[PDB]
Write a protein that binds this ligand. Structure first.
Ligand SMILES: [Mg+2]
Ligand SMILES: [Mg+2]
Ligand SMILES: [Mn+2]
Lengths: 79, 79
């Protein structure tokens, strides 16, 4: 499973989810095509677990880092 | 890193964290000695991501499952 819904409606998402598929899931709106690629791109480095950024009205937080691999993300809608 | 603190004070924790070390971290109070072992023990099966249970005044939620391995947990204090 690449994506699951938590009890509060927020999403746990695999770093490999393609950005195209992500956009379609979130109903939202390079040098990347997956969610993990996008995070590396934003930070310009491999982020710590618990770091986050805001993208297309959503907060993306790193929740699991396996070696250098951004394995799992938490997505929550702002507001 | 086996454990990190999120912005809201909740913990992201590796399934391998020993229960003894977990108790000491949470300030809390078999057929298991790690956090992942405890989850498998509770559910009596490999749980889905997003499943959770309450233990010693804390909520434990599965956030990343890698094959059969319970890789990452979210811990939040109740109340
Ligand atoms: Mg991990
Ligand atoms: Mg995973
Ligand atoms: Mn993982």
């Amino acid at each position: 499973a690449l994506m699951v819904t938590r009890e509060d409606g927020s999403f746990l998402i695999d770093g490999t989810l393609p950005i195209e598929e992500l956009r379609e899931v979130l109903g939202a709106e390079n040098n990347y095509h997956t969610l993990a690629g996008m995070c590396i791109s934003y930070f310009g480095r491999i982020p710590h677990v618990g770091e986050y950024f805001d993208w297309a009205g959503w907060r993306i937080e790193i929740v699991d880092l396996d070696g250098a691999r951004i394995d799992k993300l938490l997505l929550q809608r702002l507001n």
